[PDB]
């Protein structure tokens, strides 16, 4: 019966910057994605592994919600195997990404006159960022010989810089909010199911079944196969259910 607090996520009044990107683990809901899908208020809505319509009527076990504010020009970087500032030093989707990524113009909310000095993005590093690697460290990296001693100096100032976000900018030079979905599957039962309504079960007849998104055709009969409490599925040699 419970639903997903997408309201407080998307309609949130405050967003953190990309390097300090926030996370909200969400579970055990009934999800209606069509409310967003057909909202038609989103400048961009793409994802990989699942069509929107097909995901709406499907169950998943665990989902994460991540959000930040980037630049328009760089929106494309939020995709598997991209390069640039953000891909390298602020955020990097894994290649086999199975979530969903969304972005809309927020020039009317996040931009402000004189330039918004809030949001930040990491600039330099010794190495590439691993999947979902957060780096809040403002430690002055030392690419030289002389000691750094914390102070900002002739070697490698803060790997943290703020956007301008003047409203008077072009399209690509204006902030676009972003919300990255994550869809993962484990052996745990699917908690975040779609808005589908169950039917009664009919035994000893050839039926078209759907159990938690698992489909097939066959006759459902009682059994004496004693599943252990943690086991949900049994399998044949063919790897079929």
């Amino acid at each position, epitope marked *: 019966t419970n639903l997903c607090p997408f309201g407080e996520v998307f309609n949130a009044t405050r967003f953190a910057s990309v390097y300090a990107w926030n996370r909200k683990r969400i579970s055990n809901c009934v999800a209606d994605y069509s409310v967003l899908y057909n909202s038609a208020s989103f400048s961009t809505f793409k994802c990989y592994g699942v069509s929107p319509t097909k995901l709406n009527d499907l169950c998943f076990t665990n989902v994460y919600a991540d959000s930040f504010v980037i630049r328009g020009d760089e929106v494309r970087q939020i995709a598997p195997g991209q390069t640039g500032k953000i891909a390298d030093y602020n955020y990097k989707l894994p290649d086999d990404f199975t979530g969903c990524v969304i972005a809309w113009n927020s020039n009317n909310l996040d931009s402000k006159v*004189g*330039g918004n*000095y809030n949001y930040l993005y990491r600039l330099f590093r010794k190495s590439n960022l691993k999947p979902f690697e957060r780096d809040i460290s*403002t430690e002055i990296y030392q690419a030289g010989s*002389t000691p750094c001693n914390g*102070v*900002e*100096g*002739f*070697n490698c*100032y*803060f790997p*943290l*810089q*703020s956007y*301008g976000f003047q409203p008077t900018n072009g399209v690509g030079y204006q902030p676009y909010r972003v919300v990255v979905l994550s869809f993962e599957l484990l052996h745990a039962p699917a908690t975040v199911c779609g808005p589908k309504k169950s039917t009664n079960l009919v035994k000893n007849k050839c039926v078209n079944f759907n159990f938690n998104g698992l489909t097939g055709t066959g006759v459902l009969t009682e059994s004496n196969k004693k599943f252990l409490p943690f086991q949900q599925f049994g399998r044949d040699i063919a790897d079929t259910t």
Partner: antibody, heavy 120, light 108 residues
Framework: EVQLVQSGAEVKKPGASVKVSCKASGYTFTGYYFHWVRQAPGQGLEWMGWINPISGGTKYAQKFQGWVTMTRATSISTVYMEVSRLRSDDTAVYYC???????????????WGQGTLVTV | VLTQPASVSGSPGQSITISCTGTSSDVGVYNYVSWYQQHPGKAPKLMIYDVSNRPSGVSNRFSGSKSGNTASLTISGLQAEDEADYYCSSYTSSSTLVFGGGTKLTVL
């Protein structure tokens, strides 16, 4: 164009403190250091220190360490400079000046404010 | 820290020079000199950066040089409006900015 507008002229008694403001505009406020330089009447230029608007990192002149404080407010684009335990020798025109953002560098102060005369 | 002559004078149209003497921790290489012009009752403006480079709007008759631990500012075709205090400035010890004492240039 770069504009730096300082607070008006001050008079203090010996032993008191003074806090001078420098309002910045016409560029990305946080993207550049602010220097303070002072000049006693009929005398040369004396470097006081630098402040980074990002986080608030400072370095002072050695001679003023322990009675100069530099601060900034990023919301209003204003840098402040406070001097405590004032003496007659602290009678000077106090300039804020905008510079580079790489700390270790020559010719730091490029764009200068109008100057604040403080008399002690 | 840097040493300048207190006064330099010249007639309109002449060339004058202003010396700046430092050390191996400032003016000596690795080092870059800047020069400021301070017109009477005004803030300093940058005149020369990087030994000899001029900001836009600085005329070609202002020229800077550096040799070892000394620097010089040359002003050719001296004009009345050149009457100002001139400061050399330099980076010091890979830690701090230092100034010269200032040179009052007077035009005769």
């Amino acid at each position: 164009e770069v504009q730096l507008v300082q607070s008006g002229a001050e008079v203090k008694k010996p032993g008191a403190s003074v806090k001078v403001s420098c309002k910045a505009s016409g560029y990305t406020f946080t993207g550049y250091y602010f220097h303070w330089v002072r000049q006693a009447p009929g005398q040369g230029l004396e470097w006081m220190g630098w402040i980074n608007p990002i986080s608030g990192g400072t370095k002072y002149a050695q001679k003023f360490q322990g009675w100069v404080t530099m601060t900034r407010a990023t919301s209003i684009s204003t840098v402040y400079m406070e001097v405590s335990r004032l003496r007659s020798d602290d009678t000077a025109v106090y300039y804020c000046a905008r510079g580079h953002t790489y700390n270790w560098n020559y010719a730091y102060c490029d764009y200068w404010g109008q100057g604040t005369l403080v008399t002690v | 820290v840097l040493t300048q002559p207190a006064s330099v004078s010249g007639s309109p149209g002449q060339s004058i020079t202003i010396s700046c003497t430092g050390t191996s921790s400032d003016v000596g290489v690795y080092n870059y000199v800047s020069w400021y012009q301070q017109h009477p009752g005004k803030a300093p403006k940058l005149m020369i950066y990087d030994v000899s480079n001029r900001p836009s709007g600085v005329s070609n008759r202002f020229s800077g040089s550096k040799s070892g631990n000394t620097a010089s500012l040359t002003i050719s075709g001296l004009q009345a409006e050149d009457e100002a205090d001139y400061y050399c400035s330099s980076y010091t010890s890979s830690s701090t900015l230092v100034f010269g004492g200032g040179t009052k240039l007077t035009v005769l």
